Design a protein around this ligand. Structure first.
Ligand SMILES: CC(C)c1ccc(NC(=O)c2cnccn2)cc1
Length: 336
């Protein structure tokens, strides 16, 4: 029967074999060609239609054919795979967006394809392109009325995801397209928070260029605190040339930043620990007065207590071991 021929059709489409395809759906009845073109094939949890697969694989030839001659539905939904995981509620356009197949995308759009369709997780194809970072698609999608405000299931904006990856060009474009930089997320995060977690110094600039608010994480984390805790020394410095709470925010960020050099085994630099830890102690001690509420010793970090005065810190400067502990103690205080 036809569940067999259906594959032979799904095959050709997936592989871009436009000739094989065309030959396969000639002298076929309209009732038949609809069945074949709409069949949903499962190739490893991947439920897809011929259109959808060819759109996912960048087979413009096959894609043009399906649309021009056979005039298959542009809204066919499906469940496709991308680098391991499988997304649900996808249209050909969604696959072509995140797969960077600009040629396929224009063609899909030019043949009247919903640019604002929302997958199961409510992910615009624009969202896909902002993840991928194929700026031309982004531009072109936006030029064809793709709504930027549409976030995801968790209120992750296209702006955020781009700030997560390093897509400085895309972020800047979205900002000019007036994407709200102060959008918040379920976890209570801003594009600024994300790029601050990464070390996306260029993007953190543009957000600041665009008067991004300093909000708090659902954890109670400024973008600064995030970056200092994520051990992104540069970002911290930049972000600190702005309206940081006079001393409290500042000293904490420095204290945490320096502590994050003892904890983080990737970036591990104790010298940088004492540098920032001693810096912060100074900010604490120029008016004498801002003072440290120190926690009691514990077995966890040796029966040690954090330093409260510069002289206490100055003594540790040469004790690689003691400094390692201090950073832990310090981080323990600021975070818990
Ligand atoms: C759950 C949330 C709504 C979300 C939606 C789509 C993506 N998209 C990709 O991860 C991707 C990567 N590479 C190519 C194409 N797409 C990520 C997160």
């Amino acid at each position: 029967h036809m569940e067999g021929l259906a594959g032979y059709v799904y095959k050709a489409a997936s592989e871009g074999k436009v000739l094989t395809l065309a030959a396969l759906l000639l002298n076929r009845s309209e009732s038949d060609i609809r069945y074949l073109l709409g069949y949903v094939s499962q190739q490893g949890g991947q439920r897809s239609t011929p259109l959808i697969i060819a759109a996912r694989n960048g087979h413009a030839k096959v894609v043009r054919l399906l649309l021009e001659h056979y005039r298959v539905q542009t809204q066919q939904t499906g469940t496709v795979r991308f680098d391991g995981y499988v997304i649900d509620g996808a249209t050909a356009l969604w696959c072509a967006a995140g797969a960077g197949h600009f040629e396929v995308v224009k063609l899909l759009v030019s043949h009247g394809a919903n640019v604002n369709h929302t997958t199961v997780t409510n992910s615009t194809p624009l969202r896909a392109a902002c993840f991928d970072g194929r700026l031309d698609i982004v531009k072109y999608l936006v030029e064809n009325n793709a709504n930027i405000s549409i976030a995801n299931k968790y209120d992750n904006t296209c702006l955020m995801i781009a700030a997560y990856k390093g897509h400085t060009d895309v972020v800047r474009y979205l900002l000019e397209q007036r994407a709200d930089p102060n959008a918040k997320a379920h976890c209570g995060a801003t594009a600024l928070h994300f790029a601050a977690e990464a070390g996306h110094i260029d993007i953190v600039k543009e957000l600041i260029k665009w008067r991004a608010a300093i909000v708090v994480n659902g954890h109670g984390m400024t973008p600064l605190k995030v970056a200092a805790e994520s051990c992104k020394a540069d970002v911290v410095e930049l972000l600190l040339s702005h309206a940081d709470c006079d001393r409290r925010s500042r000293i904490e960020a420095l204290e945490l930043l320096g502590a994050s050099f003892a904890n983080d085994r990737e970036n591990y630099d104790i010298i940088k620990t004492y540098h920032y830890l001693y810096l912060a102690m100074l900010e604490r001690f120029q008016d004498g007065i801002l003072e440290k509420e120190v926690l009691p010793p514990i077995h966890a970090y040796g029966n040690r207590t954090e330093c409260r005065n510069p002289q206490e810190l100055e003594s540790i400067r040469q004790d690689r071991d003691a400094l390692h502990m201090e950073g832990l103690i310090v981080r323990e205080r600021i975070l818990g």
